[PDB]
Amino acid sequence: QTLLDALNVRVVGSGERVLVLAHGFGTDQSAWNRILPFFLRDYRVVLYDLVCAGSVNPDFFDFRRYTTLDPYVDDLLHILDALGIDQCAYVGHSVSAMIGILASIRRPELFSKLILIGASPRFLNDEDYHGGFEQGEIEKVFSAMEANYEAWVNGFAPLAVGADVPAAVREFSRTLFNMRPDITLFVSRTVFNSDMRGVLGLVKVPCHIFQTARDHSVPASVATYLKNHLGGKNTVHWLNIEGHLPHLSAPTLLAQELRRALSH
């Protein structure tokens, strides 16, 4: 309840089947605003802000606590428990895809289905795995973020959005720039340091892997990697949408594909 208030938990919709919409990096739950009308009639929609969102009081971001994805999982599960949800479909963008995977391992009965958008188990390359990022280049990026956060945001937002959708670039920039810079850097380091590859096989619920074209954060091969290694029944949806934030850039088309995946 203090947690429900802290993370801006919102429940809306006229349906019964519970649908959790969990935003990812650089946004808050408002990233779902243009998807939402498509689900109100026949779902009960649960939204929340990750503790690192710009819309959450930065006093709640305890750097001694949030050192791995596990405490983010704790927050998600405490929310669903407090709302009395014992089964739901879960949609996770970006880091929230991994949070949902870990949550499902902890609570295998809680999720009927996971829908993963812009998901990667590991951003960094190594000998037998392409993630899309080298350690050396990422340290240069972290230096830039520290030196001038504003300039970093304005360089990064068009890459993340990917497609030439200026409204979405401005909207992503808005919510990224609302994040306090030391939180953004710390969260970024957290996730670049994370490696979910070893746990993927532990998942037993069905996963729908939504993969856009030319996703700055997620090579096509990573979607295929998820398909091969996630332990349950997996379906890749190769969206006809460019970029890492399809909910911001192509919400009408994304909404339709989410509806199809949820009906499957």
Ligand X SMILES: Cc1c(Cl)cccc1Nc1ccccc1C(=O)O
Contacts with ligand X by CB under 6 A lie at 24-25, 94-95, 118, 141, 187-188, 191, 217
Per-state percent for the chain, helix, strand, coil, to nearest 5: 45, 20, 35
Closest CB to ligand X among residues 35, 117: 117
Q: Which residue is nearest to ligand X (CB)?
A: 94
Question: What is the spatial distance between Cα 109 and Cα 104, in angstroms, rounded to a whole number?
Answer: 8
- Where residue 98 falls (left for φ over 0; alpha for ψ -120 to 50; beta otherwise) is alpha
Shortest approach of ligand X to residue 96 CB, angstroms? 9
Question: What is the spatial distance between Cα 43 and Cα 12, in angstroms, rounded to a whole number?
Answer: 8
Angle at Cα 170 formed by Cα 165 and Cα 176, nearest 5°?
125
Catalytic residues: 94, 215, 244
Shortest approach of ligand X to residue 119 CB, angstroms? 8
Contact 25, 94 (CB under 8 A): yes
How far out from the chain centre does Cα 35 lie? 15
Shortest approach of ligand X to residue 15 CB, angstroms? 29
Residues 6+ apart with CB under 8 A from 240: 213, 253
Closest CB to ligand X among residues 173, 188: 188
Shortest approach of ligand X to residue 40 CB, angstroms? 27
The H-assigned helical ranges of the chain are 2-6, 70-82, 95-106, 135-147, 149-161, 166-178, 181-193, 220-229, 246-249, 251-263
Shortest approach of ligand X to residue 260 CB, angstroms? 23
Closest CB to ligand X among residues 19, 97: 97
Residues 6+ apart with CB under 8 A from 38: 252, 255, 256, 258, 259
Shortest approach of ligand X to residue 86 CB, angstroms? 29
Residue-wise burial string across 125-146, b where 16 or more C-beta atoms lie within 10 A, e elsewhere: eeeeeebbbeeeeeeebeeebe
Closest CB to ligand X among residues 18, 69: 69
Closest CB to ligand X among residues 211, 217: 217
Closest CB to ligand X among residues 18, 250: 250
Q: Which tokens belong to 57? A: 């009081």
